[PDB]
């Protein structure tokens, strides 16, 4: 299926200090694989997936240096926006970056990705064309114009279409068993008796990976789009997810209502009822 590598970089400015806290988190196929945190006792790039151990201590050195330069990119970038937006360093500020690439089933380049956010709102984005920039407000024009005169896009297009692609091919090779693995949801319906001669039928789905799942309730083949309570997909903590779907249904009429579960890692869509 599709494959991706992303780097989720964050710089939080701390009032009464020159250096901001800088965190970089790398993801391969939406799963943390590497991390960096300046707050840690002896700060460096650390492996977050077991297949990341099969990397020479000189790879970590190459990467750790990169984090050190980024810390300075962020510190200077934070100072300038503080000026663009006429702000005080008496308070903390947030600069965030998301960069990486997406790959087809054939491991070929689909798109490059580079976005920035200030105070958790969009600031500047590199358009899918990897040539033009999109500024979010008036202040992001100081940066859009700055980045056109310096030709910053060219530098990124080069990496996003070159080195980013290369490295993920390596990561998808070294970790394939772990990366191509899926976990099947394990469903069941719970019965909740209530007032006015009504009942809540909650169909659960547990210990599944990846996070995408579709739970639907149906009255004799017909779907209940309306008045079907859900829950946001929550992590179990063991690397797998949970999610449930409820529907208020009158008593005795239990067997009229059917529950379906859909997920990539399933020998077929689950179909189930109460008992």
């Amino acid at each position: 299926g599709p494959h991706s590598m992303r780097y989720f970089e964050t710089a939080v400015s701390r009032p009464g200090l020159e250096e901001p806290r800088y965190i970089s988190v790398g993801y391969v196929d939406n799963k943390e694989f590497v991390r960096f945190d300046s707050d840690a006792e002896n700060p460096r790039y650390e492996p977050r997936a077991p297949w990341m151990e099969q990397e020479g201590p000189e790879y970590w050195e190459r990467e750790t240096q990169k984090a050190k330069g980024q810390e300075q990119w962020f510190r200077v970038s934070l100072r300038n926006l503080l000026g663009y937006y006429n702000q005080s360093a008496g308070g903390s500020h947030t600069l965030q970056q998301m960069s990486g690439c997406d790959l087809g089933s054939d491991w070929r380049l689909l798109r490059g990705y580079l976005q920035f956010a200030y105070e958790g709102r969009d600031y500047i984005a590199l358009n899918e064309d990897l040539k033009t920039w999109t500024a979010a407000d008036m202040a992001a024009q100081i940066t859009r114009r700055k980045w056109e005169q310096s030709g910053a896009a060219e530098h990124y297009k080069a990496y996003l279409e070159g080195e980013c692609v290369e490295w993920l091919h390596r990561y998808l090779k070294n970790g394939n068993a772990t990366l191509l693995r899926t976990d099947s949801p394990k469903a069941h319906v719970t019965h909740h008796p209530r007032s006015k001669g009504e009942v809540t039928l909650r169909c659960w789905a547990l210990g599944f990976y990846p996070a995408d799942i579709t739970l639907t309730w149906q009255l004799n083949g017909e779907e209940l789009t309306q008045d079907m309570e859900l829950v946001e997909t929550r992590p179990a903590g063991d690397g797998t997810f949970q999610k449930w779907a409820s529907v208020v249904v009158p008593l005795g009429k239990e067997q009229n209502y059917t529950c379906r579960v859909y997920h990539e890692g399933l020998p077929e869509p689950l179909t189930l009822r109460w008992e």
Binding site: Y7, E9, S24, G26, Y59, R62, E63, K66, A67, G69, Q70, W73, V76, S77, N80, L81, L95, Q97, S99, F116, T143, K146, W147, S150, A152, H155, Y156, Y159, E163, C164, W167
Partner: peptide, 9 residues
């Protein structure tokens, strides 16, 4: 493997 941003903001 991460990149390094070129020009500052």
């Amino acid at each position: 493997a991460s990149d390094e941003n070129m020009e500052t903001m």
